[PDB]
Nucleic acid binder design. Structure first.
Ligand SMILES: [Mg+2]
Ligand SMILES: [Mg+2]
Ligand SMILES: [Mg+2]
Ligand SMILES: [Mg+2]
Ligand SMILES: [Mg+2]
Ligand SMILES: [Mg+2]
Ligand SMILES: [Mg+2]
Ligand SMILES: [Mg+2]
Ligand SMILES: [Mg+2]
Ligand SMILES: [Mg+2]
Ligand SMILES: [Mg+2]
Ligand SMILES: [Mg+2]
Ligand SMILES: [Mg+2]
Ligand SMILES: [Mg+2]
Ligand SMILES: [Zn+2]
Lengths: 94, 67, 148, 50, 37, 120, 94, 86, 49, 177
RNA sequence: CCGAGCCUGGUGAUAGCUGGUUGUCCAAGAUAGAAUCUUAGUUCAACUUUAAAUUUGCCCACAGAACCCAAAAUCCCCUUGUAAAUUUAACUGUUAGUCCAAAGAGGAACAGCUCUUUGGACACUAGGAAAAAACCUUGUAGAGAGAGUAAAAAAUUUAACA
């Protein structure tokens, strides 16, 4: 399993909705998505960096072709950070 | 690590870290060719080499509180 | 040669190093002859050293045919199904021992050009470089020469 | 010319370098140069050279 | 060619390096001898 | 024409400024010259390269020791432009038999007889 | 345009090479090294008469070792073991 | 890079020459056992040992030469004494 | 490894650059006064034996 | 990181639209920086085969200045291809006929001589005046600074700077001036 | 297809002249001149090569080597630093050479000219000077996704006058 990551093993739909449910269970404010950085909006290769901010605090940012891809990727990043399956996590102890 | 780094002058102490590596594979390298050719002096020569090569895997790293 | 020869990235089978190590040599098949000046080395090897080799390595299995052969062979089948055969025709006992030991220490995959001498399946910490890592933002995120 | 060759701040002078053969430059140089040291080149004469 | 020539016989590269190193570097004070003294 | 060049012996008389520059006391002169080959032996005369070979400098950047005596200083003078010379300096006296192996050279011409391989 | 008569580096007319501070500093460095060599070659340790007759023993004993090494040249020894091991090519199991 | 700096500091111009970056052992057993020396380290220490033997040889030969010279000078003095005593 | 570090962990490469810049400034202070001053904290070296 | 594969690759190998103002700046320096950024040396993932270039925009190319009489003695020379088609033109006349061609040829010379040169030069964009089309002043990222400084004029120097700068000498009164 | 026919045979004529000269791998190795109806060649010498016997071989320290008509240097040369040198048996191959630096001769104090001497290089790898034989760094041979260095990038702008 080491290589194949969480969202590569397990599939999800409406990850933004899943995140909303999760942190509403955790009793925190509903965040808003805001494009932090932009490049090539009119260009054929748009690039957006979208951050998901709650109560004036950021949890995750996500790159993306479009704003929708960027925000769903940011939701994915925040879900990874909350579930503890970040790529920078403690290796498995043997 | 994600939030900090420790670098030596030049290298770190023995007691601070412990890098552990396991051996996985011993092989002869794929056949490398050594050809020497010079021009219009019938100087043409070749040789084959298969250098040995060893594969390790870093299994774990841990740091000591000593500092 | 690299462009004529195929290539691969360094990798191991089923992550052999992390858990309990397993020598990925599975099976040996010797083809040696009773007679034949070429097979005398193989006969000496099978009479003295093969016993100790099999004792040291239980996971491996050894088959010996002992049939008429003008050139004695040794075939090695590994876990992946990788078969490789080599001729021990007119070889000394010490080089036969080194050969079988390197076979035992090898892995189940062909020897070809290795593109890189390392392999990290998660190379990045502190985040992989993107163009916006080392440059700040703007008040209200305003592009250059933009009023509102 | 005398006060210039006395007061030159350059520590390195063809006098010393050639009389010592500090870099085997006696190849490029002549035995005549040992006394025609720097001022002369062929028949010419470089007075500014010291 | 000969040593002595009508034209300036181009010298060896090492020799030209030596001649470029060896010049009269005039001993000058840090201060110009007119404005201050 | 090009021939073996005699050196004026007046060149090898150091002045007080030279002594106090290079740090060498004319009294109590050192015993041993550490020597290294710095320059190409090619494009040099046969006698120079043979002197190199007899001194044992066919290998570059490999320090080799000689005495400080005129019989050697002659060869060193005739191949001086090809080599870096330095005196030998040692605080720990002559190497003792127990420490023949754990010796180490330094870039400063020093030869330490003990090498603990550990910072103070 | 701007050709050089004949070969670029020989003859009555050649291509004019010029010197740079790079080469100047290189050669003056080498000259300072040569000056240090002169200094350390000065102030010898012993005199001619002092150093006359100390190394003769070592020199001539080394040369007589060379004598012995050059004189000790004969065919190798021949052995029945190596002669008869050739019979072991027709080894065969009963 | 920094070769001349290392030289004036006292270290090798090339860090691969000597020092702890190269002289230490590059692998040991996880149980704490010491690994055998590397062949490079072996040949380096052998070179240095021959170097030290040679230095001792040269030094004591020079000392013996000077001693023989001064003893011969004492011989000279005493034989002059003999001559005028005759 | 410097390149790999600059690629995969820019924070550590930024720390190295900060170190280098501070060492430059210490070297400039030393160029002003070589001795007769406390040497740079990072310009200090380790003596081995 | 904790990013997805394709989005991470995209964000890493993405292109960027840089802008720089050439008003009273030298074409050599501005074109040099533009070229290094076009072939993409500035990013640590530079490789020739990987087309990791970035789009560049120059502004006010008409208002550039050389150092020296280059406007007069610098000669851009080109052969059309026919007999007598060898034309030479000073930088001044070439600026009058096309104010962009100077910087264009500068970058064309700075860049390597590969087939990627044309691609990078069409990535690059040039405008002699303070005016830009909508999309290509909208989809920008950053305006990098200028290579050289603009010396100020006497009409620009404020009064406090002047009265702080000391007067150097006292003129005699009896002088027409 | 006649300065003397064509065919066969001698005849596989001869050819100091051109050309060509077949598997793998290691090493050592380009060299003064003399004679020759000889200078497009060859014999000897010298160089190189092999296998042996032997011992001095190379660098070189004071002294020493012409009057005639003021040179860099040279010969000899114990020590020393080094390990080669000589001799003995056997051949072969080279014996049509180019540039640079220096001392010179001829010529025009021209030649990428020709002719001698001392040295280097090239005809062996590599880096540099733009590509470059001869210029400068640099040799003893391999794998490397290690590092330190060598030679190594041209500077110039010019004229008033009582
Ligand atoms: Mg000449
Ligand atoms: Mg030419
Ligand atoms: Mg006829
Ligand atoms: Mg007819
Ligand atoms: Mg015939
Ligand atoms: Mg002939
Ligand atoms: Mg032919
Ligand atoms: Mg060879
Ligand atoms: Mg005769
Ligand atoms: Mg002698
Ligand atoms: Mg001819
Ligand atoms: Mg010629
Ligand atoms: Mg000529
Ligand atoms: Mg030839
Ligand atoms: Zn003034």
């Amino acid at each position: 399993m080491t290589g194949k990551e969480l969202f590569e093993m397990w599939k999800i739909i409406n990850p933004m909705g899943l995140l909303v449910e999760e942190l509403k269970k955790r009793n925190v404010s509903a965040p808003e998505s805001r494009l932090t950085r932009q490049s090539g909006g009119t260009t054929a290769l748009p690039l957006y960096f979208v951050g998901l901010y709650c109560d004036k605090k950021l949890i995750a940012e996500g790159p993306g072709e479009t704003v929708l891809v960027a925000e769903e990727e940011a939701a994915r990043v925040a879900l990874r950070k909350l579930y503890g399956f970040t790529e920078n996590r403690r290796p498995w102890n043997y | 690590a994600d939030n900090f780094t420790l670098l030596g002058k030049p290298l770190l102490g023995k007691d601070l870290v412990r890098v552990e590596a396991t051996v996985i594979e011993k092989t002869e390298s794929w056949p490398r060719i050594i050809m020497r050719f010079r021009k219009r002096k019938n100087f043409k020569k070749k040789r084959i080499v298969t250098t040995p090569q060893t594969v390790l895997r870093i299994n774990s790293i841990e740091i000591a509180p000593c500092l | 040669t690299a462009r004529g020869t195929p290539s691969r990235f360094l990798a191991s089978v089923l992550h052999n190093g992390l858990g309990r190590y397993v020598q990925q040599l599975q099976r040996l098949s010797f083809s040696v002859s009773r007679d034949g000046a070429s097979s005398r080395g193989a006969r000496e090897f099978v009479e003295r050293e093969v016993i100790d080799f099999a004792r040291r390595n239980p996971g491996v299995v050894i088959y010996v045919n002992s049939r008429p052969c003008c050139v004695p062979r040794v075939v090695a089948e590994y876990l992946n199904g990788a078969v490789r055969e080599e001729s021990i025709h007119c070889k000394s006992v010490e080089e036969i021992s080194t050969l079988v030991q390197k076979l035992a220490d090898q892995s189940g995959l062909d020897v070809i050009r290795i593109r890189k001498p390392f392999h990290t399946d998660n190379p990045s910490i502190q985040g992989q470089w993107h163009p916006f890592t080392n440059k700040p933002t703007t008040f209200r995120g305003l592009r250059p020469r933009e009023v509102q | 010319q005398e006060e210039r060759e006395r007061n030159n701040q350059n520590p390195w002078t063809f006098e010393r370098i050639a009389t010592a053969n500090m870099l085997g430059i006696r190849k490029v140089l002549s035995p005549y140069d040992l006394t025609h040291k720097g001022k002369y080149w062929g028949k010419f004469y470089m007075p500014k050279r010291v | 060619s000969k040593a002595v020539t009508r034209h300036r016989r181009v010298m060896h590269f090492q020799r030209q390096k030596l001649m470029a190193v060896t010049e009269y570097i005039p001993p000058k004070p840090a201060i110009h001898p007119s404005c201050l003294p | 024409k090009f021939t073996r060049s005699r050196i004026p012996e007046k060149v090898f008389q150091a002045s007080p400024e030279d002594h106090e520059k290079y740090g060498g006391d004319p009294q109590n002169p050192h015993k041993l010259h550490i020597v290294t080959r710095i320059k190409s032996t090619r494009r040099r005369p046969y006698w120079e390269k043979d002197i190199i070979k007899m001194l044992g400098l066919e290998k570059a950047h490999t320090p080799q020791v000689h005495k400080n005596i005129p019989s050697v200083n002659a060869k060193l003078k005739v191949v001086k432009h090809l080599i870096r010379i330095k005196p030998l300096k040692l605080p720990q006296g002559l190497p003792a038999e127990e420490n023949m192996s754990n010796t180490c050279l330094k870039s400063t011409g020093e030869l330490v007889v003990q090498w603990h391989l550990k910072p103070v | 345009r701007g050709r050089i008569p004949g070969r670029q580096w020989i003859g009555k007319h050649r291509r004019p090479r010029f010197v740079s501070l790079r080469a100047k500093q290189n050669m003056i460095r080498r000259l300072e090294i040569e000056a240090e060599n002169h200094y350390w070659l000065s102030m010898p340790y012993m005199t001619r008469e002092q150093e006359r007759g100390h190394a003769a023993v070592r020199r001539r004993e080394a040369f007589e070792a060379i004598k012995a090494a050059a004189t000790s040249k004969f065919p190798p020894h021949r052995f029945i073991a190596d002669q008869l091991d050739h019979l072991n090519v027709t080894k065969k199991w009963s | 890079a920094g070769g001349q700096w290392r030289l004036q500091q006292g270290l090798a111009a090339n860090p691969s020459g000597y020092g702890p970056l190269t002289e230490l052992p590059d692998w040991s057993y996880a149980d704490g056992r010491p690994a055998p020396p590397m062949k490079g380290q072996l040949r380096r220490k052998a070179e240095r040992e021959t170097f030290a033997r040679r230095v001792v040889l040269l030094s004591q030969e020079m000392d013996a030469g000077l001693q023989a010279w001064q003893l011969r000078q004492q011989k000279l003095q005493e034989e002059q004494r003999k001559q005028e005593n005759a | 490894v410097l390149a790999d570090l600059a690629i995969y962990e820019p924070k550590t490469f930024k720390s190295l650059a900060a170190l280098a810049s501070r060492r430059r400034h210490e070297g400039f202070a030393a160029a002003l006064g070589d001795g007769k001053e406390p040497e740079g904290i990072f310009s200090r070296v380790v003596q081995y034996h | 990181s904790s990013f997805s594969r394709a989005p991470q690759q995209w964000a890493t190998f993405a292109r960027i639209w840089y802008l720089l103002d050439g008003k009273m700046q030298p074409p050599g320096k501005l074109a040099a920086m533009a070229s290094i950024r076009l072939q993409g040396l500035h990013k640590p993932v530079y490789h020739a085969l990987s087309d990791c270039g970035d789009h560049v925009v120059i502004m006010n190319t008409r208002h550039i200045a050389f150092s020296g009489n280059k406007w007069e003695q610098k000669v851009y020379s080109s052969h059309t291809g026919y007999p007598g088609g060898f034309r030479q033109v000073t930088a001044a006349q070439l600026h009058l006929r096309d104010p962009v061609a100077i910087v264009k040829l500068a970058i064309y010379g700075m860049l390597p001589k590969n087939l990627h040169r044309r691609t990078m030069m069409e990535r690059l964009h040039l405008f002699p005046d303070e005016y830009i089309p909508e999309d290509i002043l909208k989809n920008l990222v950053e305006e990098l600074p200028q290579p050289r400084k603009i010396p100020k004029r006497l009409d620009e120097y404020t009064q406090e700077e002047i009265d702080a700068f000391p007067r150097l000498w006292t003129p005699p009164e009896d002088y027409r001036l």
